[PDB]
Write an enzyme that holds these catalytic residues in place. Sequence first.
Site, PDB file in Angstrom:
ATOM      1  N   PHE B 289     -10.799   2.676   0.783  1.00 25.45           N
ATOM      2  CA  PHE B 289     -10.543   4.143   1.945  1.00 25.45           C
ATOM      3  C   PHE B 289      -9.138   2.712   1.939  1.00 25.45           C
ATOM      4  O   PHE B 289      -8.465   2.290   2.444  1.00 25.45           O
ATOM      5  CB  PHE B 289     -10.562   3.827   2.673  1.00 25.45           C
ATOM      6  CG  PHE B 289     -12.791   4.729   2.861  1.00 25.45           C
ATOM      7  CD1 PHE B 289     -13.231   4.383   2.779  1.00 25.45           C
ATOM      8  CD2 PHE B 289     -12.061   5.916   3.481  1.00 25.45           C
ATOM      9  CE1 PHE B 289     -14.462   4.772   2.635  1.00 25.45           C
ATOM     10  CE2 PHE B 289     -13.717   6.590   3.979  1.00 25.45           C
ATOM     11  CZ  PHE B 289     -14.490   6.281   3.714  1.00 25.45           C
ATOM     12  N   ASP B 290      -8.364   3.176   1.276  1.00 23.10           N
ATOM     13  CA  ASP B 290      -6.684   2.322   1.048  1.00 23.10           C
ATOM     14  C   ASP B 290      -6.037   2.778   1.596  1.00 23.10           C
ATOM     15  O   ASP B 290      -4.988   1.524   2.260  1.00 23.10           O
ATOM     16  CB  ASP B 290      -6.164   3.164  -0.267  1.00 23.10           C
ATOM     17  CG  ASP B 290      -6.508   2.247  -1.535  1.00 23.10           C
ATOM     18  OD1 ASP B 290      -6.459   1.131  -1.730  1.00 23.10           O
ATOM     19  OD2 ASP B 290      -7.135   3.300  -2.429  1.00 23.10           O
ATOM     20  N   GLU B 293      -8.108   1.372   5.289  1.00 20.82           N
ATOM     21  CA  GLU B 293      -9.257   0.495   5.674  1.00 20.82           C
ATOM     22  C   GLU B 293      -7.544  -0.347   4.991  1.00 20.82           C
ATOM     23  O   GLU B 293      -7.268  -1.886   5.918  1.00 20.82           O
ATOM     24  CB  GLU B 293      -9.939  -0.166   4.876  1.00 20.82           C
ATOM     25  CG  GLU B 293     -11.153   0.665   5.121  1.00 20.82           C
ATOM     26  CD  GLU B 293     -12.232   0.612   4.203  1.00 20.82           C
ATOM     27  OE1 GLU B 293     -13.172   0.768   4.632  1.00 20.82           O
ATOM     28  OE2 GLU B 293     -11.662   0.569   3.291  1.00 20.82           O
ATOM     29  N   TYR B 294      -6.703  -0.174   4.362  1.00 22.79           N
ATOM     30  CA  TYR B 294      -6.060  -1.264   3.940  1.00 22.79           C
ATOM     31  C   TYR B 294      -4.592  -1.445   4.307  1.00 22.79           C
ATOM     32  O   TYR B 294      -3.323  -1.724   4.734  1.00 22.79           O
ATOM     33  CB  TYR B 294      -6.001  -1.588   2.033  1.00 22.79           C
ATOM     34  CG  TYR B 294      -6.594  -1.972   1.750  1.00 22.79           C
ATOM     35  CD1 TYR B 294      -7.844  -1.726   1.206  1.00 22.79           C
ATOM     36  CD2 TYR B 294      -7.183  -3.698   1.702  1.00 22.79           C
ATOM     37  CE1 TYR B 294      -9.371  -1.810   1.082  1.00 22.79           C
ATOM     38  CE2 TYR B 294      -8.190  -3.917   0.908  1.00 22.79           C
ATOM     39  CZ  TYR B 294      -9.302  -2.480   0.285  1.00 22.79           C
ATOM     40  OH  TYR B 294     -10.495  -3.112   0.218  1.00 22.79           O
ATOM     41  N   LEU B 295      -4.097   0.280   4.289  1.00 22.13           N
ATOM     42  CA  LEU B 295      -2.439   0.351   5.390  1.00 22.13           C
ATOM     43  C   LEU B 295      -1.670   0.219   3.708  1.00 22.13           C
ATOM     44  O   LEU B 295      -0.429  -0.549   3.409  1.00 22.13           O
ATOM     45  CB  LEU B 295      -2.408   0.148   6.283  1.00 22.13           C
ATOM     46  CG  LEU B 295      -2.771  -0.155   7.585  1.00 22.13           C
ATOM     47  CD1 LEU B 295      -2.333  -1.150   8.003  1.00 22.13           C
ATOM     48  CD2 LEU B 295      -3.773   1.169   7.559  1.00 22.13           C
ATOM     49  N   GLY B 297       1.478   2.457   2.938  1.00 18.48           N
ATOM     50  CA  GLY B 297       2.126   1.189   3.181  1.00 18.48           C
ATOM     51  C   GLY B 297       2.862  -0.218   3.477  1.00 18.48           C
ATOM     52  O   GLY B 297       3.999  -0.316   2.953  1.00 18.48           O
ATOM     53  N   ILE B 371      -2.333  -2.434  -4.244  1.00 18.77           N
ATOM     54  CA  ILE B 371      -3.148  -2.633  -3.900  1.00 18.77           C
ATOM     55  C   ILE B 371      -4.577  -3.891  -4.530  1.00 18.77           C
ATOM     56  O   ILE B 371      -5.044  -2.785  -5.523  1.00 18.77           O
ATOM     57  CB  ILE B 371      -4.286  -1.507  -3.144  1.00 18.77           C
ATOM     58  CG1 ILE B 371      -3.215  -1.047  -2.206  1.00 18.77           C
ATOM     59  CG2 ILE B 371      -5.604  -2.409  -2.255  1.00 18.77           C
ATOM     60  CD1 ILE B 371      -3.832  -0.070  -0.843  1.00 18.77           C
ATOM     61  N   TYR B 374      -5.128  -2.395  -8.696  1.00 14.70           N
ATOM     62  CA  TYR B 374      -4.821  -0.812  -8.849  1.00 14.70           C
ATOM     63  C   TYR B 374      -2.733  -0.659  -7.844  1.00 14.70           C
ATOM     64  O   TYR B 374      -2.617  -1.231  -7.467  1.00 14.70           O
ATOM     65  CB  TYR B 374      -5.734  -0.131  -8.443  1.00 14.70           C
ATOM     66  CG  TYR B 374      -6.094   0.508  -9.157  1.00 14.70           C
ATOM     67  CD1 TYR B 374      -7.573   0.638  -9.124  1.00 14.70           C
ATOM     68  CD2 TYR B 374      -5.717   1.114  -9.991  1.00 14.70           C
ATOM     69  CE1 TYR B 374      -7.846   0.998  -9.505  1.00 14.70           C
ATOM     70  CE2 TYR B 374      -6.745   1.894 -10.851  1.00 14.70           C
ATOM     71  CZ  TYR B 374      -7.584   1.321 -10.790  1.00 14.70           C
ATOM     72  OH  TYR B 374      -8.791   2.114 -12.222  1.00 14.70           O
ATOM     73  N   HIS B 425     -11.034   8.669  -7.783  1.00 12.43           N
ATOM     74  CA  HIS B 425      -9.629   8.541  -6.915  1.00 12.43           C
ATOM     75  C   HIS B 425      -9.625   9.629  -5.869  1.00 12.43           C
ATOM     76  O   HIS B 425      -8.700  11.035  -7.282  1.00 12.43           O
ATOM     77  CB  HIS B 425      -8.322   7.908  -7.613  1.00 12.43           C
ATOM     78  CG  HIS B 425      -8.749   6.605  -8.905  1.00 12.43           C
ATOM     79  ND1 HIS B 425      -8.128   5.752  -8.192  1.00 12.43           N
ATOM     80  CD2 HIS B 425      -8.759   6.543  -9.226  1.00 12.43           C
ATOM     81  CE1 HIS B 425      -8.467   4.873  -9.097  1.00 12.43           C
ATOM     82  NE2 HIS B 425      -9.082   5.510 -10.162  1.00 12.43           N
TER      83      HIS B 425
HETATM   84 CU   LIG Z   1      -9.644   3.939 -12.246  1.00 17.31          CU
END
Ligand SMILES: [Cu+2]
Lengths: 620, 620
Positions: B289-290, B293-295, B297, B371, B374, B425
């Site tokens: 969950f980019d 979970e990761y943020l 920005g 991230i 990616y 995605h």
């Molecule tokens: Cu892909």
Amino acid sequence: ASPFRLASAGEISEVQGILRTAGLLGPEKRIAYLGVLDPARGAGSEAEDRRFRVFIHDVSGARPQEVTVSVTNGTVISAVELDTAATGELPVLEEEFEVVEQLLATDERWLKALAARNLDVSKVRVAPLSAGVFEYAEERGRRILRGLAFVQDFPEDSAWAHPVDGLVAYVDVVSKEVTRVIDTGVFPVPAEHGNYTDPELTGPLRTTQKPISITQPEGPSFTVTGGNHIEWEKWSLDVGFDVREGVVLHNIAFRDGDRLRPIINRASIAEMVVPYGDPSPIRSWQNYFDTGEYLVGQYANSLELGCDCLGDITYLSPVISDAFGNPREIRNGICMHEEDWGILAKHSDLWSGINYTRRNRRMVISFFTTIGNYDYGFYWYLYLDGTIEFEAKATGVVFTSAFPEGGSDNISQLAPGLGAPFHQHIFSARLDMAIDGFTNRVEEEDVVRQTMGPGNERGNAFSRKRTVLTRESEAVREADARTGRTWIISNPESKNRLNEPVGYKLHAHNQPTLLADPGSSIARRAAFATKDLWVTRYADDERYPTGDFVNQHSGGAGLPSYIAQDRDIDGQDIVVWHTFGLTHFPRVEDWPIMPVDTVGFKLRPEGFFDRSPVLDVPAN
Amino acid sequence: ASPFRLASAGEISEVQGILRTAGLLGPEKRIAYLGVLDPARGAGSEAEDRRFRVFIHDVSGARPQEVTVSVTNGTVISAVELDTAATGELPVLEEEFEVVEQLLATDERWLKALAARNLDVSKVRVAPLSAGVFEYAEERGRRILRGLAFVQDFPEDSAWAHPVDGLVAYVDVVSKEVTRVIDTGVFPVPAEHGNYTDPELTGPLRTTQKPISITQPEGPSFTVTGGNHIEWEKWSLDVGFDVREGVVLHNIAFRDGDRLRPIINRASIAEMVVPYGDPSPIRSWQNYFDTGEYLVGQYANSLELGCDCLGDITYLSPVISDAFGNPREIRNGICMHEEDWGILAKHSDLWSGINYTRRNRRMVISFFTTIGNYDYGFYWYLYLDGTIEFEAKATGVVFTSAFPEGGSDNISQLAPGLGAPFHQHIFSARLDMAIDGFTNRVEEEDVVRQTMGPGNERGNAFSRKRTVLTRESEAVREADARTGRTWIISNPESKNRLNEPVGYKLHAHNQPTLLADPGSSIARRAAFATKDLWVTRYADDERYPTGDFVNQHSGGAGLPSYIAQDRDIDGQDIVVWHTFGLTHFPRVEDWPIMPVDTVGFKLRPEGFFDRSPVLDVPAN
Ligand SMILES: [Cu+2]
Ligand SMILES: [Cu+2]
Ligand code: NA
Ligand code: NA
């Protein structure tokens, strides 16, 4: 030297002389179509033989002819008389458009209908439109056009703002008779003008747009040789032009190291149909086959530098024949240029510390045509990464009607009393495939969902399936956006380094296909438009999805009859026909001149290369 | 002055000071999220009150807190202790990623697994990935990351070319414990390198690309005031930046004559999920969950002039907080520029003699995030004709695995022994609508086919139907590309000059939604991804489709819980949530670095204006 070079003024002049000497081009004869024939299948075809195909109309009423001449040798190859009641009428002649308005202007029923509406006949323009095939037995074997009226308040006025609804006429354009005038009742003629250059309507023009300057100080990256052969960023192809289809792409291939690898042998828009969805008897017959009935190439615009085409532009000026066989040049009718296309590939890697960015580019080959109220741009794009894309751009003025008191389920209102009937714009792309050569096949690829259970205990797995289309009778396919359906054209005899067949994947937009009832006349005449994908075995004479003679042909010609041969297409010389279109419910914002809307398709490599083909693009 | 201005370094430092003074930010505390709150509903309201929301992590294992601060008044407004086993863990901290590889380097189970494979621990990189919620009861209430290994042959080597399959480890990043090491068997480590800057792989770089120069000799046509307020070609908006969501667009409005007309109050990508479809136990838990979970920005790139953004570029450099409350500037993190966009409108009229062509333009607002392997570009476009479009660009390096002997239904082969698991995605756009104000509704529009018969005797008619979504319980909608399905957001209290409600039409790409089994963990955590369109009644605290705390959170929050309130959405303050995504079956051409692929959506005016809004564009 190239057999795929554009036709020249001299070739068309020689055709005219050959026809004249043969007795086939008298004063009553008209050229309805003229075009060069592609070389027949033959990888060792060396002896140059430039052949031209001609449709000859006769304005006295005699039967028309299809003629094939050899310009190289100066001979007529064959000449066949046509029975148009059987095989269809010839395409509409530009000079027949004038005839409709002139004939109606002296017809007493037409004059009486205008007098009832207090319209000056000198201000009434008539849109001359193709007839189709319906219930009128007296039209079989006869060249008919139907006319709808619009009022032009002054010579610079936009007549489309002033439709005269409730009135339609049918005209025999060779015997010059008005066969029927149908008046279903008086509708008010919408009064507001639609003059998009009138300051009263535009208001003061914006002063806020600052210039965007696009230049190439070292010139373009592509080369043009032999008049129309293009080399650009590993791509190689020939840009042809035909008066019916417009721009045609030949011999599309990609230089992969030391090998020139074929991809597509011939790409064209082989038909386009514009069916109207208004059940009013005034318009329920209205269906334009812009390619097959009108010939979109002969109405190509001269494209102006800095307005139509911006940047460092290379022009082609194709030559076509007029109705008497004289060459006519379409100055600056094709634009070619390259364009920046944003980021191609980018990665910033934490572990290696390498930050990598590369930019993308595309080659653009475009032309624009105008058929009556509508203007269409045809764009072919070649990208660095092997992607091929087509885009159609629809603009112009929407076709109008009255807006009925009490509304309509089939017409939208654009201005007080002014309606715009619902319609579609549907294209057929004919892709003569040659993926690494001519031994190709098509697979349909669907996403496959999997159920949670043994071997998928967390319920996360998903997969895909591919189905080979082995015979033409199973090669008529529908879109399925919900399962991510695409089609892969592969060469089963040419493998990549992973020992998988090389291929290209067709990505459709999955827009609706033809909406008309399957029993309708338009569904029979435009059967190609009822399905998203067709695959046929290649044959020299199977050129158009609607047949050779579309005008007033009763139906079934073209793809349904080809497909009926049920030929082997599993590892053969095949042709993909893709249907795609726009469904247009006009909006107020489409009036008085419509902002561009678009539709298209693209093909992406699918294991065609052994790795990314753009690793050698520099940073600069 | 503007309440929508970007956060400044001084504001973030003041938040730090306010938290410190209040006893909430001692040396064991870490800021996991910090962002400005939007003003509450109420035009003008509180003169000026800038409020910030903060998620505070405790590295000693004490409960984290959610805190709201007023930086204007220097006060803590509220501070609540979180029970993370119930409501979810805080976002992953950048400093926790570095913990995983170090802890594993001294675990004897990890070392024994690497020794069995003859791998040097000093060359093994570990990708630290979010854990999700599965069958491991010991993980409830703990901050867990899972690690997958890759070999780096030398410091500049691309480790993604060398996955170590059959091995995964789970790490408690607070107590610094390796909880499990799972070894399902030895797989060959793929040997080919994937170094896309190595000349032995790229070959000699192309010398054929000539430069394309794009300049604006009078500067750009847009103005930037107050740091982030944009005016461009009748458009007005504020460009925000949030560390979770990235670029956020506020107050999108169009100047129509004398009236500034609102269109969208707030537009963002409020979540994005990347689920993997490989059922191997080594990867069957893998879901990013980019955003949540990761943020995204937090990982925005600095964009290089001439490479990432080409033309006359205006940059914004947003400020975010580091984990200690110090301001960190993301230099050149947002690019803004206008671009030529081809033909806007064109018509050559036979009857009037007028030839008319205008060119189109778009305003581009973009940023790029990285991230791990990616890289995603986020592009917002505004067009002259009122169209608003979003486009996501996916590139980077695909996530790899071994390719099994005998093949796989869930993994593509990219190189000898090297696989790429299938995955999606999927994005969620949150559009807080304000079409001519806050009284809005949504209608679903389908094409309607009509049977040949009375009132449609020629079988050509087709129509459309609109269905108003009146309550949240009926506002969970699926795509239907076959019936041309779109959604119209309208204002039933604001009519155009034809007495029809003004509206905007949402055009989806109609790509597949979430493919995982509906019983799966990911289907419950990413329920938003299983449907194309959701409509909620606006509420201050309903910000993300997955809830506030996504990391290691089971189902129970987000859109399914919001719509259960079944609130009135028929002429009310509403929010549209649109799911759209890419389904990625990797191809050979995606390796070793992937060319951009794209997905998005757009909104077009639908009777919002009284006629075309670009009649005042000059010819140039
Ligand atoms: Cu892909
Ligand atoms: Cu149209
Ligand atoms: Na072929
Ligand atoms: Na709203």
